[PDB]
Amino acid sequence: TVWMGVVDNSGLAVSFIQSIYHEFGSGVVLPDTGIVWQNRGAAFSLDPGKQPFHLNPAAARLNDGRVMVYGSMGGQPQTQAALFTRYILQGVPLQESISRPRWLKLEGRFEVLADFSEAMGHAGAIVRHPNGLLEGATDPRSNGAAAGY
C-alpha cells in the first residue's frame, strides 16, 4: 500500500492511495502484461459484479488557511489520532508530529516495542500555508522522500 501527496502552485492538493492489498497480490501475472493482479477474496464471505466495502486517504482544511494532505501505510486509526492531535491540536511541527513514537502497544522511544516499529505505520503529509510556502514530511520509519521546488 502506497500513500502519496501532491500540492501544485495554485494550491490544488491531492492525497492518493494505491494498493494490491497483499504482497504481490495473487502471485498471478497476466500473460505478456507484467501486471500482477490484486487478491481481495477477503472483502467477501461465504454465507458477482459485487463491489467490495473499503482504504482511507485523508485531507484537511484549517480555519487559519492551511490545507493539508496526509496518509498512513501499514499498521492505523490511532496513527491518524496521533498526527491530528500532535500537529493540529498541539502545535508540534509537522515533521516532528509524524516522528514522535506511536501506539497500537507503545514504541520504546517513550507492551513496549522497538524504538521504531513498522506496526505504528508509515505516514506522510504536506501542509500548504496561506503564505504559499509548502511543507512536506516523511516518516523516519521508512525511506520516503519529499521533493519540492
Binding site: 502552485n9 494505491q18 498471478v28 500482477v36 477477503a42 472483502a43 502545535g91 506522510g124 510556502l133 514530511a137
Partner: protein
C-alpha cells in the same frame, strides 16, 4: 527537519516517484497529472506493494471548493459466483481464483484527469504522464531492498503461480538489492496506455488482451466486467472540528469510528495517549449491518467522561 518549498511538493514512498510528480509540476502540469505520473512510476518501482493490477483512492482538495473523492476499486468478476468456490471455507489467497475483483487505479487516473481538465483549463499529453514509468520499465529500476525481501519471503509460496518466476525472479531467486531490474512486459503495457489512452485498459486493445489472459488463466473475470467499470465518486466522510474541516474517504460503517476519535477536540504528555479512552467510548458509539453525519460537537460532548 522538514523540506520546505514555494511552488510545488510531492511526498512518496520512493524518491523516484516523488521526482516523477515533481517534474510534471515544473513542466506546468497540475497536482493531479503529477499524481498520475507518480502512480505509474511507483507502480514500476514498488511492484510488490502496488501497481496497475490493483485499486486506487483519491481525495482531492481544490483551492476553493469542496473536496472530491474517487473510489477507484473494482468489483468481483461476473464469473465469481457463490457456487464456484464449492466447500472451500474461504476464497483462496493466491492463484487465479484469488484474482477475482477488477483492478481500479487506472480508472482512477482516467477520472482524476478529466477532473484536472475541468479544474485546470489545460492538460498535458498522456504520453508525457507515463514517460518516466515506461523508461524505468525498459531500462530498469534500482531494486529496492523491500522488493527483494518481499520476493524472498514469498518465494516458496508464489514460486509456481502463472507468470510469477518469469516476471519477478532472477536466476530463479529474489533479485539482489541495488541491482538493475527490468520489466520488459510492463513497458509494452504502459506503451499501449500511452498510444491508446488510459481507458483502453477497460475499453480498448489492452482490455481485450487482458480478457484473453484471464480466460487462459481461469480467472473469474470477463471483458464485460472491464468495459462495465468506472471509478466511483462517493462523498468524503467530513469531520467539523474547532480548527476546521477534515475529510476521510470511507463508508459510514468503517470510518465513523476513526473520525469520532478526533471529535478529543482540550489537549494543548502521557495523558495524551490516555485521553485511547476516547477510542474506547468511540467504538461504543457505533454499537444493524453496515447500516449519518452525527459527528457534531452537539453529539460527541457526552468526551465529558
Amino acid at each position: 527537519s522538514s523540506n520546505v518549498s514555494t511552488h510545488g511538493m510531492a511526498v512518496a514512498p520512493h524518491h523516484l516517484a516523488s521526482q516523477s510528480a515533481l517534474a510534471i509540476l515544473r513542466e506546468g502540469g497540475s497536482a493531479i497529472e503529477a499524481m498520475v505520473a507518480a502512480a505509474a512510476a511507483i507502480a514500476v518501482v514498488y511492484p510488490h506493494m502496488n501497481g496497475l493490477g490493483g485499486d486506487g483512492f483519491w481525495l482531492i482538495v481544490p483551492p476553493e471548493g469542496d473536496p472530491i473523492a474517487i473510489d477507484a476499486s473494482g468489483a468481483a468478476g461476473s464469473l465469481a459466483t457463490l457456487e464456484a468456490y464449492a466447500g472451500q471455507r474461504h476464497i483462496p489467497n493466491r492463484g487465479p481464483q484469488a484474482a477475482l475483483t477488477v483492478a481500479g487505479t487506472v480508472s482512477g487516473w482516467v477520472e482524476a484527469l478529466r477532473i484536472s481538465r475541468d479544474l485546470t483549463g489545460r492538460a498535458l499529453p498522456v504520453a508525457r504522464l507515463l514517460a518516466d514509468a515506461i523508461g524505468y520499465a525498459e531500462d530498469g529500476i534500482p531494486v529496492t531492498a523491500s522488493q527483494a525481501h518481499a520476493t524472498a519471503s514469498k518465494l516458496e509460496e508464489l514460486r509456481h503461480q502463472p507468470g510469477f518466476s518469469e516476471t519477478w525472479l532472477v536466476a530463479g531467486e529474489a533479485p539482489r538489492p541495488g541491482s538493475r531490474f527490468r520489466q520488459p512486459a510492463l513497458a509494452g503495457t504502459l506503451r499501449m496506455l500511452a498510444s491508446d489512452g488510459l481507458d483502453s485498459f477497460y475499453r480498448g486493445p489492452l482490455a481485450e488482451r487482458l480478457a484473453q489472459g484471464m480466460a487462459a488463466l481461469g480467472m473469474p473475470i470477463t471483458l464485460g466486467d472491464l468495459q462495465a467499470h468506472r471509478a466511483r465518486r462517493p462523498g468524503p466522510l467530513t469531520l467539523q472540528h474547532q480548527q476546521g474541516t477534515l475529510w476521510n474517504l470511507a463508508p459510514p460503517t468503517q470510518g465513523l469510528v476513526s473520525l469520532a476519535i478526533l471529535g478529543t477536540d482540550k489537549m494543548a504528555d502521557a495523558q495524551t495517549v490516555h485521553r485511547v479512552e476516547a477510542t474506547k467510548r468511540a467504538f461504543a458509539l457505533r454499537d444493524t449491518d453496515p447500516r449519518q453525519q452525527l459527528l457534531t460537537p452537539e453529539a460527541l460532548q457526552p468526551a465529558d467522561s
